[PDB]
Structure formats: structure tokens, C-alpha cells
Amino acid sequence: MHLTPEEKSAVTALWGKVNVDEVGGEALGRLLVVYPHTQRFFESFGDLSTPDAVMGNPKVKAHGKKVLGAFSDGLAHLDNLKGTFATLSELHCDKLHVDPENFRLLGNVLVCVLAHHFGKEFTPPVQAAYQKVVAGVANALAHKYH
Amino acid sequence: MHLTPEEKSAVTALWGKVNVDEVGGEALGRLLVVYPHTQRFFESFGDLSTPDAVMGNPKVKAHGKKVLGAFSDGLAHLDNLKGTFATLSELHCDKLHVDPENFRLLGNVLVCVLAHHFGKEFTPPVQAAYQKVVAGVANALAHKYH
Amino acid sequence: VLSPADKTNVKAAWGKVGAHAGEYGAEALERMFLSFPTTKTYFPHFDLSHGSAQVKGHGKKVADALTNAVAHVDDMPNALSALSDLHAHKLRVDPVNFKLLSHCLLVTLAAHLPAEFTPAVHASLDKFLASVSTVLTSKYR
Amino acid sequence: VLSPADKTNVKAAWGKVGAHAGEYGAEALERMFLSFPTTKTYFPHFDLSHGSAQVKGHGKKVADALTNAVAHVDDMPNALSALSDLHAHKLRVDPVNFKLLSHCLLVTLAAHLPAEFTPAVHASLDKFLASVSTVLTSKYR
Ligand code: HEM
Ligand code: HEM
Ligand code: HEM
Ligand code: HEM
Structure with missing residues (x-):
């Protein structure tokens, strides 16, 4: 992946400041609100x-949380996303049948949410490397659909 | 570019039967007729x-012909589409300004055209292989955009 | 927007298809599943094996629908209202997939109708599937 | 389909925007050029540098076009028509780019309106944007 040191640095950097526990809820949550069609994946979740x-x-x-958990674990592994997400890809495709286009959606909703917690500090160049990372994570989760 | 040998081979054996002057004009031409906005790019081509x-x-x-000409160099070095189309890339990004979304269009029209030509011989499986190739190509063309 | 001319070519192309519609639909469908593996996620209760009854059955439902659109061109949204509620609100398929099924239709059509599939026919046909696709994803929200 | 509540939210959020609109628009354009280089092929003539002045003013023009778009919520397709030809017809801007730009307008406003950008508003802005996007992209064929 086209991740220069600067970018990696800036990515990895901003991440340590992130409340894993609360950010992931913000996200899967906004996903469920903003793009309602996703909800058809979590009937088991009760009321929506x-x-x-x-x-x-x-x-x-x-x-x-789990989702952001795995994300984290992927930013600790930027130069090997596909592998890190290999098993999670299969599952995401073979057992749950999620059209991969949806990853791009969580991912961008994700960029929106960080944008919201950090304000001004989520500067453009920073967003830049975030998109490069959310793009990656989406291709690597999409990488074993067959 | 997960190209399986049965595909490298499927793609290969067919290309050998392509009448370059004909499929080349035809693709480029169907591209201007089906997606008239591409027309702007060759304003200087004259009556369209x-x-x-x-x-x-x-x-x-x-x-x-020159375009198909270059697709050929790509089938000759599929394991190096980037290196191959590197120069063409910047040309298209630095001098020309074509939004790399048009590449998919081109590749698809083109897949459109081989099928118009080879009829039943352009079986499904084969189509899947060219789809991979035409995608590798758009990508490679898009790579050096900055 | 469908032009008088597009409509005309669409009627012609599609009538040439004639009683091949379904056969064309299944071929198209199958071409979609191999080329864009990800569309298979919306059909997990399907045998998606080469030439197989579900798909060969479904191809028929898909090309009969198209047929209803050709006949009902000047008025596509009411003609198709149902198909809209199942694809957008119930099935909930992502617009990208429609661009793919179209492309495949065109390949299929393009490969059985060598002489009708001219560059104007090709064009119109593309506006037509695009339109069907809109009407079909329109009620997302 | 924009809804009463959706509408009520676009307005309230567009209002806190206020006179940061322009500025917000520029930040947005900037965020786009920086994260989606492809988009700049539409701007080969602009000074696209960080802090550029050709930028600000364009952003300025974009946010006003959006304000107007809000002001004529119920008749967007007309209200925004002249901008439609501009982008469909002369500029000839491929749709995806509309999505990237909306994504950035969202990001930008997200970073400026901590407390206005609640889920339900976020849900309405992507929709509104989608809407202004559907109008500016529709004469594309
Ligand atoms: C960053 C992108 C995503 C990542 C990293 C991610 C990660 C995960 C993880 C770690 C799990 C749990 C693994 C397991 O259950 O054994 C998961 C499960 C699951 N995921 Fe994803 N996910 C992503 C996006 C999505 C989205 C977009 C959907 C659907 C919209 C989705 C649908 C599901 C479903 C249905 C489960 C099982 C739910 C359950 O156990 O009740 N995932 N995802
Ligand atoms: C991957 C698909 C494509 C390939 C492989 C390709 C190939 C080429 C090639 C080989 C040239 C040669 C010119 C030289 O060597 O000096 C070229 C130039 C050009 N390309 Fe592409 N091209 C593609 C797609 C596109 C598309 C989508 C557009 C926009 C509609 C476009 C617009 C142009 C234009 C306008 C020229 C120069 C015409 C002139 O003034 O001579 N190309 N392209
Ligand atoms: C021209 C575009 C399309 C048309 C005209 C079309 C038409 C239809 C029709 C007529 C049905 C039958 C439902 C009934 O019996 O009442 C159907 C069902 C279905 N379609 Fe489409 N469709 C199109 C595109 C798509 C695509 C793009 C997808 C996803 C890739 C899709 C996925 C489905 C699924 C999953 C079903 C339900 C099949 C089942 O549950 O047995 N369709 N579609
Ligand atoms: C909500 C989305 C957008 C809005 C509201 C918008 C609004 C406008 C307005 C009002 C103008 C010029 C009006 C005048 O003549 O003074 C304009 C021009 C332009 N827009 Fe858009 N725009 C949008 C998206 C885009 C997209 C996505 C692009 C391509 C990435 C784009 C590229 C351009 C270009 C190249 C011009 C001409 C600028 C020049 O050459 O001076 N715009 N836009």
C-alpha cells in the first residue's frame, strides 16, 4: 500500500488518541442510521x-467494539493487511454474505466519525492517510470473496 | 492480478485471433458513441x-489501433502492468486530464466488442478472464496519477 | 431520459431477442456470477453451478421483467413499482450491482445478435438498462 | 425522496453553518483534492496549492450554490438547473466525483459542528447531498 512514512506516522499517531470502546459504537451506529439498508445484517440486534x-x-x-478492535489490530499491521484480514474475509463472505461495497461504507462513516471527535486536528492531509487506510482495509476484507 | 494460468491462457489464445485494425476502431468508436462525453477528449479528431x-x-x-496496440503490450507482460503502462499513465494524467473513471468505460465497451466479434466463442469463463485484464489495465493506467 | 429514437431501437433489439429472452437472461446471469463474484452474496439460497435450474429459472424471471419494460417504456416507474419495492426495500441490493448486470446483459445481447447490436443500438440499450436500473434502486430513500 | 424531517435538519444544520459556508466549501474542495487526486483533473487550470486563493472563491461559489439549493428545497431540479448543464454538459463530471465531494462536505461539517452533527442530521445531510448530486448529474445522457 502507498503508505509513506509521513502518512503511516500520522495515521498511527492520531490512533493512540482514540477511545476504542466508544468510537466503534459511534461508527457501527452511524452506519446503521445513515445507510439503513445495512441493518439487514443484524436482525439479532433487537430494536433499530x-x-x-x-x-x-x-x-x-x-x-x-469488536469491529474497531480488528481495525486496530490491522493498523498494527499496515504492511500486511490482506493476511491479517484473510480469515475475516472468508467469514465475511462465506458465512454472512456481505456485499463488499458495504465495507467502503463503514470505512467512510468511520472517517466521518473520527472527523467529529477531533475537529480541526483531523486536518486534510491526515484525512488523506485515513482514506488510504480505510480503502486498504476494505480491499483486504474484500480480497477472499470468491 | 490473481491471473490463473488457465486464464492467462484463455486470455492469450483469443487475443491471437483478434483483428487489430477492426476491434480497435470499433472499441474506440463505440466508446464515443455510447459515452458521448468522452467525445470532448478528441475534439481535435474532427467530425464526431x-x-x-x-x-x-x-x-x-x-x-x-494505437490503443489496442498498447493493450497488447499489456497481455505480453501481465505480471507487470504498472511498469508497462507507467508512462502512458502520466501522459493521461499530466497532459491529457482524463478522469480515470473513463478507463473502466473503455475496458467494458471493449469487452463489449470482443464479444460482438467472437460470438459464442466468447464463453462466460473467458469473459471473466478479460474482466480481470481490463481491470488490471484501468488500474495500471490510473496508478501514476498524483 | 429515453428518446423517441432510443425507444425505437430498444423495441427492435428486444424484439429480435424474441423468444430467446430467458435463455439470454440466464446466460447473462451466469456471466455476472463468474465475472463479478461478489454479486453472489445476494443469492446464497441458490445453486449457482454451471447451467443450473435456479439460475436458468431466474434468468426467465429477469428477462420477462425486462420485457415488461420494453413494452411499458414511456412509463417505466409505475410499470415497475413492484420490482422497485423488492430490490430497494426488501432485497436491498447495492446500485453497483446493477451496473454489472447491465454490462453482462449487453455482452450477452452483444454476442447473440451480431447484426442488430450496432453502435446506436449498443448506445440506446445502455440508456435503457441504466434507466431500468434507476427505477429499480430509486426507492433506496 | 427528501422528508419533512430530513428538511428541517438540512436547514438547521445549514444555518449554524452561517458565514463559515464559503470557508467550509473551500475546506471541502481542499479535502477532496487532497484525498482523491483523480478529482483534480477537472481543475487543470486552478492554482491547486495549499491555501490557494482560486480555491477559496470557488468553494465560495459552491457553498452558495448549496445555500440556494437549501432555500429551494422543494424544487431543486429547477432551482439548480443551470448548474446541471454546467456539470453534465460542458464540464462533463463523472458521478463518482460527486460522492467524494459529498463525503468531504460531510467530513468538513463534522469537524466544525461537533454538536450539530448527530446521527439523524448526518443521515439527513448525506441524503440532501445525494439529492443535489442526483440533480447535477442527470443530464449526463
Ligand atoms: C472495517 C470493516 C469491517 C470489519 C473490520 C469487520 C469486522 C467484523 C468482525 C471482527 C466481526 C466478528 C467476527 C466473528 O463474529 O466471528 C464481524 C462480524 C460480523 N460482521 Fe463485520 N466488519 C466490517 C464490516 C462489516 C459490515 C459492513 C457488515 C455489514 C454491513 C458486517 C457484517 C457482520 C455480521 C453480520 C457479523 C456477525 C454478527 C453477529 O455475530 O451477530 N461487517 N465483522
Ligand atoms: C486503458 C485504456 C486506455 C488505453 C490503454 C489508452 C491508450 C492510449 C495511447 C496508447 C495513447 C497514445 C498517444 C501517444 O503515444 O503519444 C493515448 C492517448 C490518448 N488517450 Fe488514452 N487510452 C485509454 C483510455 C483513454 C480514455 C478513457 C480516454 C478519454 C476518453 C483517453 C484519451 C486519450 C487521448 C485524448 C489521447 C491523445 C489523442 C491525441 O491527441 O493524439 N484514453 N491513449
Ligand atoms: C435489470 C436489472 C434487474 C431486473 C430487471 C431484475 C428483476 C428481478 C425480478 C423480476 C425478480 C423476481 C421477483 C419476483 O418473482 O417477483 C428479481 C428477484 C431478485 N433479484 Fe433482480 N433484477 C435486476 C437486477 C438484480 C441485481 C443487480 C440483483 C443483485 C445483483 C438482483 C437480485 C435479485 C435477487 C436476490 C432476487 C430474489 C431472487 C429470489 O429470492 O429467488 N436483481 N429481480
Ligand atoms: C454539490 C456538489 C457541487 C456543487 C454544489 C458545485 C457547484 C458549482 C458551481 C456553482 C459552479 C460555477 C458557477 C459559476 O459559473 O459561477 C461550479 C463549477 C465547477 N465545478 Fe462544480 N459543484 C459541485 C461539484 C463539483 C464536482 C464533483 C466537480 C468535479 C470534481 C466540480 C467541478 C467543477 C468545475 C471544473 C467547475 C468550473 C470551474 C471553473 O473552471 O471556473 N464541481 N460548480
Whole structure:
């Protein structure tokens, strides 16, 4: 991946400041609110009829964490995304049948959410390397659909 | 570019039967007729008013040949599409300004055209292989954009 | 926007297809599944093996629908309202996939109708599938 | 389909925007050029440097076009028509670029309106944007 040191540096950097636990909920949550069609993947989550029902759902908050958890684990492995996400790709394709276009959606919703926690500090060049990273993570999760 | 040998081979055996002057004009030409906005790029090509005009224009048939010409260099070094199309890339990004989204269009029209030519011999499996190739190509063309 | 001319060519092309519609649909469908593996995620309750009853059955439902669109061109949204509620609200397929099924249709059509598939026919046909695709993803929200 | 509530939110969020609009628009354009280099092929003539002055003013022009678009919520396709030819017809801007730019307008506003950008508003802005995008892209064929 086209990750220059600067970028990596800046990526890795901003990340240490991130409340893993609460950020992941923010995200899976906004995903569920902004692009409603995704909801068809978590019937098991109970109520999703209003935004408050989603943003506040504990089952959403927990899942969100796992997702951000795996993301983290991928930023500790930038030069080997495909592998890191190999097993998670299969599962995401073979067991749950998620059209990969949806990764791009979480990913950008993700960029929006960081943008919201850090304000001004989420400067353009920074966003830049975030998109390079969320793009990566999406291709690497998409990489074993067959 | 996960190209399986049965595909490198599928792609290969067919190319050998391609009438370059014909498929080249035809693709480039179907590209201007089906996606008229690409017309702007070769404003300097002359009359592109009507179908018969575009399909009949010697600057269009010729350029056509030069484009297919270059697809050829790509099938000859599939394991190095980037290196191969590096120069062409910047040309298209630095002097020309074509939004790399048009490359997909081109590749697809083109896949469109080989099939118009080879009819039943352009079986599904084969189409999947060219799809991979035409995608590797757009990508390589897009690589050196900055 | 479908032009008087597009409509005309679409009627002609599609009538040439004639009783091959379904056969064309299944071929198209199958071409989609091999070329863009990711579209298979929306059909996990399907045998998607080479030439197989589900797909050969579904191809028929897909090309019959198209047929209803050709006949009902000047009025595509009411003609298709149902198909809209199933693809957008119930099935919920991502617009990208439609661009892919179109391309495949065109390949298929392009490869059985060597003489009708001219550059104006090709063109129109592309505006037509695009339109069907819009009407079909329109009610996302 | 934009909804009463969606509408109520675009307005309230566009209002806190206020006179940071222009500025916001420029930041957005800048965010786009920086994260999606391809988009700059539409601007070969601009000084695209960090802090550029050709930029600011264009952003300026973009945010106003959006304000106007809000002001004529119920008749966007007309209200924004002259900008439609501009982009469909002379400029000839491929749709994806609309998405990248909306993505940035979202990001930009996200970073400036901590407390206005709640989920339900975020849901309405992507929609509104989608909408202004559908209008500016529709004469593309
Ligand atoms: C950054 C992109 C994503 C990452 C890193 C990610 C990661 C994960 C992880 C770690 C799991 C749990 C693994 C396991 O359950 O064994 C997961 C599970 C799952 N994922 Fe993803 N995911 C992503 C996007 C998505 C999205 C977009 C969807 C659908 C929109 C999705 C659908 C699901 C579903 C249904 C489960 C199982 C739910 C359950 O156990 O109740 N994932 N995802
Ligand atoms: C991967 C697909 C494409 C390939 C392989 C390709 C190839 C080429 C080649 C070989 C040239 C040669 C000129 C030279 O050597 O000096 C060229 C130039 C050019 N390309 Fe592409 N091209 C592609 C797609 C496009 C598309 C999508 C556009 C925009 C519609 C475009 C616009 C041009 C133009 C306008 C020229 C120069 C015409 C002139 O003034 O001579 N190309 N391209
Ligand atoms: C020209 C574009 C398309 C048309 C005209 C079309 C038409 C149809 C029709 C007529 C049905 C039958 C439902 C019924 O029996 O009432 C159907 C079902 C379905 N379509 Fe499409 N479709 C199109 C594109 C797509 C694409 C792009 C996808 C996803 C790649 C898709 C996925 C499905 C699925 C999953 C079903 C349900 C099949 C089942 O559950 O048995 N369709 N479509
Ligand atoms: C909501 C999205 C957008 C809005 C609201 C918007 C608005 C405008 C307006 C108002 C103008 C010029 C009006 C005048 O003549 O003074 C303009 C011009 C232009 N826009 Fe758009 N625009 C949008 C998206 C884009 C897209 C995505 C691009 C391509 C990436 C783009 C590229 C251009 C270009 C090249 C010009 C001409 C600038 C010049 O050469 O001076 N715009 N836009």
C-alpha cells in the first residue's frame, strides 16, 4: 500500500488518541442510521427503529467494539493487511454474505466519525492517510470473496 | 492480478485471433458513441457528430489501433502492468486530464466488442478472464496519477 | 431520459431477442456470477453451478421483467413499482450491482445478435438498462 | 425522496453553518483534492496549492450554490438547473466525483459542528447531498 512514512506516522499517531470502546459504537451506529439498508445484517440486534434505538443499543455498542478492535489490530499491521484480514474475509463472505461495497461504507462513516471527535486536528492531509487506510482495509476484507 | 494460468491462457489464445485494425476502431468508436462525453477528449479528431461519422473517422480508427496496440503490450507482460503502462499513465494524467473513471468505460465497451466479434466463442469463463485484464489495465493506467 | 429514437431501437433489439429472452437472461446471469463474484452474496439460497435450474429459472424471471419494460417504456416507474419495492426495500441490493448486470446483459445481447447490436443500438440499450436500473434502486430513500 | 424531517435538519444544520459556508466549501474542495487526486483533473487550470486563493472563491461559489439549493428545497431540479448543464454538459463530471465531494462536505461539517452533527442530521445531510448530486448529474445522457 502507498503508505509513506509521513502518512503511516500520522495515521498511527492520531490512533493512540482514540477511545476504542466508544468510537466503534459511534461508527457501527452511524452506519446503521445513515445507510439503513445495512441493518439487514443484524436482525439479532433487537430494536433499530429510531436513531436512539440504534445509537443506544448495547448490542450495537458491543459489536462496534469488536469491529474497531480488528481495525486496530490491522493498523498494527499496515504492511500486511490482506493476511491479517484473510480469515475475516472468508467469514465475511462465506458465512454472512456481505456485499463488499458495504465495507467502503463503514470505512467512510468511520472517517466521518473520527472527523467529529477531533475537529480541526483531523486536518486534510491526515484525512488523506485515513482514506488510504480505510480503502486498504476494505480491499483486504474484500480480497477472499470468491 | 490473481491471473490463473488457465486464464492467462484463455486470455492469450483469443487475443491471437483478434483483428487489430477492426476491434480497435470499433472499441474506440463505440466508446464515443455510447459515452458521448468522452467525445470532448478528441475534439481535435474532427467530425464526431453522428454514429456513422464516428465509426467512419480515420483519426478514430487509427488512434483506435494505437490503443489496442498498447493493450497488447499489456497481455505480453501481465505480471507487470504498472511498469508497462507507467508512462502512458502520466501522459493521461499530466497532459491529457482524463478522469480515470473513463478507463473502466473503455475496458467494458471493449469487452463489449470482443464479444460482438467472437460470438459464442466468447464463453462466460473467458469473459471473466478479460474482466480481470481490463481491470488490471484501468488500474495500471490510473496508478501514476498524483 | 429515453428518446423517441432510443425507444425505437430498444423495441427492435428486444424484439429480435424474441423468444430467446430467458435463455439470454440466464446466460447473462451466469456471466455476472463468474465475472463479478461478489454479486453472489445476494443469492446464497441458490445453486449457482454451471447451467443450473435456479439460475436458468431466474434468468426467465429477469428477462420477462425486462420485457415488461420494453413494452411499458414511456412509463417505466409505475410499470415497475413492484420490482422497485423488492430490490430497494426488501432485497436491498447495492446500485453497483446493477451496473454489472447491465454490462453482462449487453455482452450477452452483444454476442447473440451480431447484426442488430450496432453502435446506436449498443448506445440506446445502455440508456435503457441504466434507466431500468434507476427505477429499480430509486426507492433506496 | 427528501422528508419533512430530513428538511428541517438540512436547514438547521445549514444555518449554524452561517458565514463559515464559503470557508467550509473551500475546506471541502481542499479535502477532496487532497484525498482523491483523480478529482483534480477537472481543475487543470486552478492554482491547486495549499491555501490557494482560486480555491477559496470557488468553494465560495459552491457553498452558495448549496445555500440556494437549501432555500429551494422543494424544487431543486429547477432551482439548480443551470448548474446541471454546467456539470453534465460542458464540464462533463463523472458521478463518482460527486460522492467524494459529498463525503468531504460531510467530513468538513463534522469537524466544525461537533454538536450539530448527530446521527439523524448526518443521515439527513448525506441524503440532501445525494439529492443535489442526483440533480447535477442527470443530464449526463
Ligand atoms: C472495517 C470493516 C469491517 C470489519 C473490520 C469487520 C469486522 C467484523 C468482525 C471482527 C466481526 C466478528 C467476527 C466473528 O463474529 O466471528 C464481524 C462480524 C460480523 N460482521 Fe463485520 N466488519 C466490517 C464490516 C462489516 C459490515 C459492513 C457488515 C455489514 C454491513 C458486517 C457484517 C457482520 C455480521 C453480520 C457479523 C456477525 C454478527 C453477529 O455475530 O451477530 N461487517 N465483522
Ligand atoms: C486503458 C485504456 C486506455 C488505453 C490503454 C489508452 C491508450 C492510449 C495511447 C496508447 C495513447 C497514445 C498517444 C501517444 O503515444 O503519444 C493515448 C492517448 C490518448 N488517450 Fe488514452 N487510452 C485509454 C483510455 C483513454 C480514455 C478513457 C480516454 C478519454 C476518453 C483517453 C484519451 C486519450 C487521448 C485524448 C489521447 C491523445 C489523442 C491525441 O491527441 O493524439 N484514453 N491513449
Ligand atoms: C435489470 C436489472 C434487474 C431486473 C430487471 C431484475 C428483476 C428481478 C425480478 C423480476 C425478480 C423476481 C421477483 C419476483 O418473482 O417477483 C428479481 C428477484 C431478485 N433479484 Fe433482480 N433484477 C435486476 C437486477 C438484480 C441485481 C443487480 C440483483 C443483485 C445483483 C438482483 C437480485 C435479485 C435477487 C436476490 C432476487 C430474489 C431472487 C429470489 O429470492 O429467488 N436483481 N429481480
Ligand atoms: C454539490 C456538489 C457541487 C456543487 C454544489 C458545485 C457547484 C458549482 C458551481 C456553482 C459552479 C460555477 C458557477 C459559476 O459559473 O459561477 C461550479 C463549477 C465547477 N465545478 Fe462544480 N459543484 C459541485 C461539484 C463539483 C464536482 C464533483 C466537480 C468535479 C470534481 C466540480 C467541478 C467543477 C468545475 C471544473 C467547475 C468550473 C470551474 C471553473 O473552471 O471556473 N464541481 N460548480
